[PDB]
Design an enzyme around this catalytic site. Structure first.
Site, mmCIF file in Angstrom:
data_model
loop_
_atom_site.group_PDB
_atom_site.id
_atom_site.type_symbol
_atom_site.label_atom_id
_atom_site.label_comp_id
_atom_site.label_asym_id
_atom_site.label_seq_id
_atom_site.Cartn_x
_atom_site.Cartn_y
_atom_site.Cartn_z
ATOM 1 N N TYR A 46 -24.194 103.704 -103.501
ATOM 2 C CA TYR A 46 -22.799 103.481 -103.076
ATOM 3 C C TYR A 46 -21.958 104.254 -104.117
ATOM 4 O O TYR A 46 -22.126 104.041 -105.306
ATOM 5 C CB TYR A 46 -22.383 102.013 -103.028
ATOM 6 C CG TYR A 46 -22.062 101.522 -101.626
ATOM 7 C CD1 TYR A 46 -20.882 101.893 -101.000
ATOM 8 C CD2 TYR A 46 -22.941 100.707 -100.922
ATOM 9 C CE1 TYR A 46 -20.583 101.475 -99.716
ATOM 10 C CE2 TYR A 46 -22.655 100.284 -99.634
ATOM 11 C CZ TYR A 46 -21.471 100.669 -99.029
ATOM 12 O OH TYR A 46 -21.173 100.265 -97.766
ATOM 13 N N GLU A 48 -18.170 104.966 -103.628
ATOM 14 C CA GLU A 48 -16.773 105.028 -103.182
ATOM 15 C C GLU A 48 -15.887 105.570 -104.293
ATOM 16 O O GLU A 48 -16.100 105.280 -105.483
ATOM 17 C CB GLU A 48 -16.256 103.653 -102.750
ATOM 18 C CG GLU A 48 -17.017 103.164 -101.490
ATOM 19 C CD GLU A 48 -16.529 101.855 -101.019
ATOM 20 O OE1 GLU A 48 -15.907 101.173 -101.844
ATOM 21 O OE2 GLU A 48 -16.742 101.526 -99.837
ATOM 22 N N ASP A 192 -8.659 123.876 -87.337
ATOM 23 C CA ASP A 192 -9.975 123.270 -87.145
ATOM 24 C C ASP A 192 -10.938 124.419 -86.886
ATOM 25 O O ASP A 192 -11.058 124.897 -85.752
ATOM 26 C CB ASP A 192 -9.931 122.281 -85.979
ATOM 27 C CG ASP A 192 -11.241 121.547 -85.780
ATOM 28 O OD1 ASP A 192 -12.273 121.945 -86.375
ATOM 29 O OD2 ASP A 192 -11.236 120.577 -84.987
ATOM 30 N N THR A 218 -16.666 121.218 -89.324
ATOM 31 C CA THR A 218 -17.971 120.559 -89.359
ATOM 32 C C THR A 218 -18.770 121.356 -90.388
ATOM 33 O O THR A 218 -18.381 122.479 -90.663
ATOM 34 C CB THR A 218 -18.669 120.758 -88.007
ATOM 35 O OG1 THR A 218 -18.551 122.119 -87.600
ATOM 36 C CG2 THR A 218 -18.115 119.824 -86.951
ATOM 37 N N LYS A 221 -23.084 123.591 -86.993
ATOM 38 C CA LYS A 221 -22.644 124.628 -86.060
ATOM 39 C C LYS A 221 -22.916 126.001 -86.709
ATOM 40 O O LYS A 221 -24.033 126.197 -87.224
ATOM 41 C CB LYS A 221 -21.146 124.474 -85.617
ATOM 42 C CG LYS A 221 -20.958 123.122 -84.901
ATOM 43 C CD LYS A 221 -19.577 122.889 -84.228
ATOM 44 C CE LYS A 221 -19.517 121.533 -83.403
ATOM 45 N NZ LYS A 221 -18.108 121.192 -83.203
ATOM 46 N N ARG A 227 -25.359 117.759 -90.496
ATOM 47 C CA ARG A 227 -24.331 117.224 -89.607
ATOM 48 C C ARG A 227 -23.308 116.403 -90.406
ATOM 49 O O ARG A 227 -23.662 115.412 -91.066
ATOM 50 C CB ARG A 227 -25.007 116.384 -88.517
ATOM 51 C CG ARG A 227 -24.118 116.050 -87.339
ATOM 52 C CD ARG A 227 -24.941 115.464 -86.182
ATOM 53 N NE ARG A 227 -25.697 116.511 -85.504
ATOM 54 C CZ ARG A 227 -25.182 117.291 -84.564
ATOM 55 N NH1 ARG A 227 -23.910 117.168 -84.188
ATOM 56 N NH2 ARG A 227 -25.940 118.263 -84.037
HETATM 57 N N1 LIG Z 1 -13.895 91.734 -102.153
HETATM 58 C C1 LIG Z 1 -14.189 93.052 -102.090
HETATM 59 N N2 LIG Z 1 -15.000 93.556 -103.073
HETATM 60 C C2 LIG Z 1 -15.375 94.875 -103.045
HETATM 61 C C3 LIG Z 1 -14.798 95.700 -102.105
HETATM 62 C C4 LIG Z 1 -14.022 95.117 -101.030
HETATM 63 O O1 LIG Z 1 -13.492 95.806 -100.142
HETATM 64 N N3 LIG Z 1 -13.691 93.782 -101.139
HETATM 65 N N4 LIG Z 1 -15.169 97.063 -102.082
HETATM 66 C C5 LIG Z 1 -15.026 97.843 -100.980
HETATM 67 O O2 LIG Z 1 -15.325 99.030 -100.943
HETATM 68 C C6 LIG Z 1 -15.833 97.626 -103.266
HETATM 69 C C7 LIG Z 1 -14.735 98.116 -104.228
HETATM 70 N N5 LIG Z 1 -13.877 99.047 -103.519
HETATM 71 C C8 LIG Z 1 -12.501 99.111 -103.551
HETATM 72 C C9 LIG Z 1 -11.834 100.348 -103.624
HETATM 73 C C10 LIG Z 1 -10.448 100.418 -103.630
HETATM 74 C C11 LIG Z 1 -9.655 99.270 -103.563
HETATM 75 C C12 LIG Z 1 -8.157 99.300 -103.569
HETATM 76 O O3 LIG Z 1 -7.495 98.329 -103.185
HETATM 77 N N6 LIG Z 1 -7.581 100.446 -104.007
HETATM 78 C C13 LIG Z 1 -6.138 100.638 -104.043
HETATM 79 C C14 LIG Z 1 -5.489 100.176 -105.360
HETATM 80 C C15 LIG Z 1 -6.315 100.360 -106.624
HETATM 81 C C16 LIG Z 1 -5.648 99.832 -107.921
HETATM 82 O O4 LIG Z 1 -4.428 100.067 -108.085
HETATM 83 O O5 LIG Z 1 -6.396 99.195 -108.707
HETATM 84 C C17 LIG Z 1 -5.810 102.140 -103.787
HETATM 85 O O6 LIG Z 1 -6.778 102.930 -103.838
HETATM 86 O O7 LIG Z 1 -4.605 102.411 -103.553
HETATM 87 C C18 LIG Z 1 -10.319 98.030 -103.481
HETATM 88 C C19 LIG Z 1 -11.703 97.942 -103.467
HETATM 89 C C20 LIG Z 1 -16.773 96.634 -103.936
HETATM 90 N N7 LIG Z 1 -16.188 95.308 -104.031
HETATM 91 C C1 LIG Z 2 -18.415 93.512 -94.992
HETATM 92 C C2 LIG Z 2 -18.347 95.001 -95.011
HETATM 93 N N1 LIG Z 2 -18.006 95.717 -93.965
HETATM 94 C C3 LIG Z 2 -17.915 97.063 -93.906
HETATM 95 C C4 LIG Z 2 -18.206 97.862 -95.010
HETATM 96 C C5 LIG Z 2 -18.038 99.377 -94.813
HETATM 97 O O1 LIG Z 2 -19.268 100.016 -94.771
HETATM 98 P P1 LIG Z 2 -19.355 101.585 -95.172
HETATM 99 O O2 LIG Z 2 -19.262 101.678 -96.671
HETATM 100 O O3 LIG Z 2 -18.253 102.334 -94.487
HETATM 101 O O4 LIG Z 2 -20.701 102.051 -94.714
HETATM 102 C C6 LIG Z 2 -18.603 97.190 -96.189
HETATM 103 C C7 LIG Z 2 -18.903 97.925 -97.408
HETATM 104 N N2 LIG Z 2 -18.942 97.354 -98.547
HETATM 105 C C8 LIG Z 2 -19.204 98.017 -99.827
HETATM 106 C C9 LIG Z 2 -17.892 98.641 -100.192
HETATM 107 O O5 LIG Z 2 -17.195 99.200 -99.096
HETATM 108 C C10 LIG Z 2 -19.647 97.042 -100.988
HETATM 109 O O6 LIG Z 2 -19.523 95.862 -100.723
HETATM 110 O O7 LIG Z 2 -20.041 97.507 -101.998
HETATM 111 C C11 LIG Z 2 -18.667 95.736 -96.221
HETATM 112 O O8 LIG Z 2 -18.983 95.081 -97.216
#
Ligand SMILES: Nc1nc2c(c(=O)[nH]1)N(C=O)[C@@H](CNc1ccc(C(=O)N[C@@H](CCC(=O)O)C(=O)O)cc1)CN2
Ligand SMILES: Cc1ncc(COP(=O)(O)O)c(/C=N/[C@@H](CO)C(=O)O)c1O
Lengths: 402, 402
Positions: A46, A48, A192, A218, A221, A227
Site C-alpha cells: 500500500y 497512498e 487525450d 493509456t 495501445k 494496461r
Molecule cells: N480511518 C481511516 N484510516 C485510514 C484511512 C482511512 O481512510 N480511514 N486511510 C485511507 O487511505 C489510510 C490513510 N490515508 C489517508 C490519506 C489522506 C487523508 C486526508 O484526509 N488527507 C487530507 C488532509 C491531510 C492533513 O492535512 O493531514 C488531504 O490530503 O487534503 C486521510 C487518510 C490508512 N488509515
Molecule cells: C473499507 C475500505 N474501502 C475501500 C478502500 C479503497 O481501496 P483501494 O485502495 O482503492 O484499492 C479501502 C482502502 N483502505 C486502505 C487505505 O485506502 C487502508 O486501510 O490502508 C478501505 O479500507
C-alpha cells in the site's frame, strides 16, 4: 493446490492469441519483462500518496520505482510533470476533469460516432453525466475535423475544458489551433493521446505537450505498455492540483506493480528500437490501407497519418457487422465502426476499424500487407472456410508473439 | 535489452519484504499463482462490456475467465450477483454511489477518525465532493459504535445511502441493525467489507450479504488476492444497474489479467486451509494486542474482534507519524492512523494501526506474538539500533515465503 481450471483457460488464451491476426487498433502485445514487472511482489505494498510523501511505512523502494517511472515519462515525452498512478485511461481523464471542472460545467469533446471516446462526453459515461457536453465531429465533405466549426461551437457554448484526441480518428491533430481556440474562450485544452501515445513517443506524431494544458493517456495501445493510465503536463502547478485529484480524490492505493511495468515500458520506448517499431507501425497501416483500396474498398479520409484506418465497406455492399463476423470466422479480429454520416445504425455501421500496432509487434512488415489485404478481402467476398482459417492460423503462427 | 535498473529495484523490494515485519493491516502477500495470473498475457485483450456481451470479438476465453471469477465470488460470499471489474476498492465504491445516488444526495458513513474510509464521505474525496455527507462515530467511553446514535442520525438527515464498514474499526458490525435503520429512512445499505472480506469468507466475521443492498470490497486485504475491487449483491436486478455504472459509466477496458488473479484468489479462499489461516489471523491480532496492552500500550476499545487494532500513543507522548518512523527504522512497518476523536490531522495522527494478515501468511503463530510485541515496544522506547534491526531481520527471515 494449483488452480488448474483457471490456468487451463490462460493456456487457451495464450493459444488463441498466437493463432489469430489481431487487427483491433487499440491492441498490442506487451513484452515478457513488462509482464514480469506486473506480476511482481510490488502488488503487496500500500503506497497512498506520492514518493517521499506516503501514508504508510515501508515505501522506500516503491518510491524509487514510482520516481523512476515519473522521470522516464518526463524524459520520453518532454514533459515537466507526470502522474503514473491512474489505474486506466478513463481514470486519467476522470482525475483531470475533476481537477479542472465542477459538476455542471461544460465539457467539449469529439462525438463518439465521429471517433471520440466514451470519456469525451458520452451520456452513458460519467463525462456526460456529471458535465454538460458540447460535441464536435467531422465534416461530411472532408471526413476531417473542421476547426472553424470547433471554434464556432466553443464561442457559442464557452466550454470550461476542450478535449482533443480520439479513439478512431485516422489523421493528425492541429494542436496549435485547438490551443488557440481554447485560449479565445478561456478553456483548458486537454489532449487525450491514448491511441497515438507511442507514435508521439517515437517522434512520428505531433507532440501535444507544448500546446495542451494537460495530456492524458493509456500506457497500453501504441505505447505498448501495461494496461493503465498516465497524465503529463508542462505546468507543474497544474500538476500538483491533478495529483490531489488522483489521490485522495478518486483513487486509493496505486498499483505499484503496474507502475513498475510502466517504468519498463518507458525504458523500452526510450530505446532507438522503439522508433523503428513505430515507423513500421505507421508504414504498415498506410500500406495495408493502400492495398485494401486497390482491392476495391474505400478508405475514410483517403488514408491515414497514424496506426489506424477506417474501411468504408459500401463499394462491396457489406455492413461493418457482417464484415466483423466474416473476419472473426477466419481468425481475423477487427471492429465495426461508423463511417462519417453513416447511413446504417450504430449496431450495424458501414465500416470497420483496423490498426497495425499488434501485428507489427509480431514482426509483420510492409511487404506482407498485400497478403494481409488479400486474406481480408477473401474472407469478406467468399465468407468463411476451413482452408482460409488455417491459412490465417499458419500465417499468425509464423509471426511469433513476444 | 533488459531493464536492469528497474529489476534491481524489484529485487530490493523483494529483499525488503523478506527482512522486516509488515504489520500494515491492509496488506498481505499474494501467492505465486496469483502473481502468475496477474503477469499473464490476458492484459493484451480489450474486453469492454461483460461476458457474452462484449463490444469486440475474440473474448471467448476471456469470458470464461471473468465468469469463473464472478461465479466463485458468488459462491464464496453467498451472493446472487458479482461484478469483478472494479480496478480498486475506490472504483467499486464510486460506481455503487453513482448507481444509487445523484450528485447532491445525502450519503451517511462512518467518520474518518472514528474508523471510516476516505470514500465513506471525506471532503477531499469524490464521496464528500459529489454528495452531502453526514457521519456517525463511536462513543467516547467504549469507542464502540452506538446503534441508537446511528439510528438518530439517519432519522434526522434521511440519507439516500448508509455505508457500514470501515478502514480501522476493530470490532464486529451489526449488519441486521444497520439494515433496519436504513429501512426506517428508505436508504440503501452499502457494506464496504474490504478490510474483513477474507474473515467473512472464512465464517469468522458476520456476513453482510443478506442485510446489505450492495456489498463492496477490495480483493487484496484479508482476501489475500490481487490488488483490485469487487461488488456483490443479493439482488441481481440492482446488480444490472451497477454493472452499467462500472462500464460504460466510470471504467473502460477491465484488467482481465487481474480478474484472472481474482479467480485464483477466490479458489484459494474456498480451500479449507484458508479458514485455518483466517482463524490464526484473528488469534494473532488478539494476542498481539493483548501482549502490547500488558506492556502498557492503550488499545482502542481494549482489543479487537478482527485482524486489526489501533494503539493510542497519546500517553507515550508520540505522534503516529513519529511511531511509524521509529518502527520503520528497525524494519517494523506500520502506518500512522487516526484514532477516534484524534486531535491531530491525518498526516500526523495520535496512533498507529497494526494488523496481522501479512505476517500470518508468512507463518507467524500466536506464540510468536510476545516476541513481536517486545520488538515493537523496544523500537518505540529505545529508538533505533543495529542490534534491534538485526533481531527483527532474523525473526522475519525465519519465516520465508516464495
Ligand atoms: N480511518 C481511516 N484510516 C485510514 C484511512 C482511512 O481512510 N480511514 N486511510 C485511507 O487511505 C489510510 C490513510 N490515508 C489517508 C490519506 C489522506 C487523508 C486526508 O484526509 N488527507 C487530507 C488532509 C491531510 C492533513 O492535512 O493531514 C488531504 O490530503 O487534503 C486521510 C487518510 C490508512 N488509515
Ligand atoms: C473499507 C475500505 N474501502 C475501500 C478502500 C479503497 O481501496 P483501494 O485502495 O482503492 O484499492 C479501502 C482502502 N483502505 C486502505 C487505505 O485506502 C487502508 O486501510 O490502508 C478501505 O479500507
Amino acid at each position: 493446490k494449483r488452480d488448474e481450471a483457471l490456468f487451463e483457460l490462460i493456456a487457451l488464451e495464450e493459444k488463441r492469441q498466437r493463432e489469430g491476426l489481431e487487427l483491433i487498433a487499440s491492441e498490442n502485445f506487451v513484452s515478457k519483462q513488462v509482464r514480469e514487472a506486473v506480476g511482481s511482489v510490488l502488488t503487496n505494498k500500500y503506497a497512498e500518496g506520492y514518493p517521499g510523501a506516503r501514508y504508510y511505512g515501508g515505501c522506500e523502494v516503491i518510491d524509487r520505482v514510482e520516481s523512476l517511472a515519473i522521470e522516464r515519462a518526463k524524459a520520453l515525452f518532454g514533459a515537466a510533470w507526470a502522474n503514473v498512478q491512474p489505474h486506466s485511461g478513463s481514470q486519467a481523464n476522470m482525475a483531470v476533469y475533476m481537477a479542472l471542472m465542477e459538476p455542471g460545467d461544460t465539457l467539449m469533446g469529439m462525438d463518439l460516432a465521429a471517433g471520440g471516446h466514451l470519456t469525451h462526453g458520452s451520456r452513458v459515461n460519467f463525462s456526460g453525466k456529471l458535465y454538460k457536453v458540447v460535441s464536435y465531429g467531422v465534416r461530411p465533405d472532408t471526413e476531417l475535423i473542421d476547426l472553424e466549426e470547433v471554434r464556432r461551437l466553443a464561442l457559442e457554448h464557452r466550454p470550461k475544458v476542450i478535449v482533443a484526441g480520439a479513439s478512431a480518428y485516422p489523421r493528425f491533430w492541429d494542436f496549435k489551433a485547438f490551443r488557440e481556440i481554447a485560449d479565445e474562450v478561456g478553456a483548458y485544452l486537454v489532449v487525450d493521446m491514448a491511441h497515438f501515445a507511442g507514435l508521439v513517443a517515437a517522434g512520428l506524431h505531433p507532440n501535444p505537450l507544448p500546446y495542451a494544458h494537460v495530456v492524458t493517456s493509456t500506457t497500453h495501445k501504441t505505447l505498448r505498455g501495461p494496461r493503465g493510465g498516465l497524465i503529463l503536463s508542462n505546468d507543474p502547478e497544474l500538476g500538483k492540483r491533478i495529483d490531489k485529484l488522483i489521490f485522495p480524490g478518486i483513487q486509493g492505493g496505486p498499483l505499484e506493480h503496474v507502475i513498475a511495468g510502466k517504468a519498463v515500458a518507458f525504458f523500452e520506448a526510450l530505446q532507438p528500437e522503439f522508433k523503428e517499431y513505430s515507423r513500421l507501425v505507421v508504414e504498415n497501416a498506410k500500406r495495408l490501407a493502400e492495398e485494401l483500396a486497390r482491392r476495391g474498398y474505400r478508405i475514410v479520409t483517403g488514408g491515414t497519418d497514424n496506426h489506424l484506418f477506417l474501411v468504408d465497406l459500401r463499394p462491396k455492399g457489406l455492413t461493418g457487422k457482417e464484415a466483423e463476423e466474416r473476419l472473426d470466422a477466419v481468425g481475423i479480429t477487427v471492429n465495426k465502426n461508423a463511417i462519417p454520416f453513416d447511413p446504417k445504425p450504430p449496431r450495424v455501421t458501414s465500416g470497420i476499424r483496423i490498426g497495425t500496432p499488434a501485428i507489427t509487434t509480431r514482426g509483420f512488415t510492409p511487404e506482407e500487407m498485400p497478403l494481409v489485404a488479400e486474406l481480408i478481402d477473401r474472407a469478406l467476398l467468399e465468407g468463411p472456410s476451413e482452408a482460409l482459417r488455417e491459412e490465417v492460423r499458419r500465417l499468425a503462427l509464423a509471426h511469433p508473439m513476444p
